[model samples]
Target: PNRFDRDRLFNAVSRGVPEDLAGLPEYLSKTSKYLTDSEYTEGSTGKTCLMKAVLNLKDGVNACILPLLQIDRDSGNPQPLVNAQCTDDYYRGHSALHIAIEKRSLQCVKLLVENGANVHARACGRFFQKGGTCFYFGELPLSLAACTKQWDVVSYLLENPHQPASLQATDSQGNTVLHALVMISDNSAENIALVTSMYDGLLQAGARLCPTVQLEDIRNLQDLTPLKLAAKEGKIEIFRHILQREF
Candidate 1:
């Protein structure tokens, strides 16, 4: 049997079809042995199984999901086949779908959504470093993507009908997708374009504007509205756009 070839397998698996055995050569015949053995440990950094491959290398998502069906058969549980949640225990309990978005793998994210990954899953990171405490609240995938300036991923989550209903989701800070976008806006020419595009998409998706009254005090703990955050942070371009909505 050909030794398990992670790279070779990745090329086939990343293509979004686990059944595509054309270029797999003998490795396809050898793959089941590896997938069945105990070499692949959940959350281990080592790249052993198809699920680990997708999480670590960001490749072979659908192919990885395909093997999951076999695992389901043996375990008599359909959870893996349907959800395929990453067992990696890091980043404030982030799921595979969250990892896909954070990794900026749009294709992987799409595959996970189509396969029924939890689009509404909440994950939070230490928002501040004072006591190394995790934020009291978590964020949905849409808010995470927006907070990180992953505009393409944001658009996909907003435009897709299958993603969780998040037009109203908020982070620990009570920042809506609109508010999160404002918080991250830096007002650079590049950032301006990115924020503007995201703003437009979110608005079209029925995201309501944060109330203007929230802008009066921009204190960090005060729950600044999107417009207030933009204004307080001196994100002029974004502030101007918000002003347009108000007037």
Candidate 2:
């Protein structure tokens, strides 16, 4: 018949998806030709049905996201939809993995990672840029986690066997995850503690990943190392924390 019913499937998946994933494959079979569409219907948002289900993940909705992926695996092409990113101005460059990190869903992040999601995907929407309304998070998945202060998600993205997050993985602005951490805070005691610890946690992981590199030596487009960004942005606790480091 016609291509897969985009809105109908989008509604089901994004609206908590199916209760039984067993029937999901069959449900998707009718529109074999349109099984791979990944953009928004009205426009070219590039927000796939998978991205829809992942935006604000709930307890039972993990199952909701799984079957959309099933259509891909059973098709001749195995995994095209997993890494699809939104191309519209608002949600530009956001994938399910990126949203999962933003939503603080460790389980969804785990599921996406285990299923071969691009750990280095960048959410370079205008909102995430410096001039945009939203705060900057350095673009890369690692940067987003550190900037958002999602430590558990950060740890898994860093330490997961499936991917090796590099300190050298720069964002759209040439910033690393370290730069993202330095670019955040509210000057509160609790905020300082959380930000500083994440900086250190990343340093610890970077050391494990590449023993020869100096965490502070890495720079962004402004030639600002994480320390310099902290100092420039007036992040006293984080700036001093870097200076106090013996390495």
Which candidate tops lDDT? 2
TM-score of each: 0.60, 0.88
Q: Cα-based RMSD of the predictions, in order?
A: 7.0, 2.8
Q: lDDT tens digits, residues 104-191, model 1?
A: 7788777767766676766654432112553322367887776666767777786676765466665555656676667567767876
Best by TM-score: 2
Q: Model 2 residue 151 lDDT?
A: 84
Q: After superposition, how far is residue 46 of candidate 2 from its true place, in Å?
A: 1.6
List candidate 2 stretches off by more than 4 Å. Answer: 1-4, 19-31, 38-44
Error at 242, model 2, angstroms = 1.5
Over 102-172, each residue of candidate 2 has an lDDT whose tens digit, in order, gives 88888888888887889998889887787636857888887888888888888888789998567679988
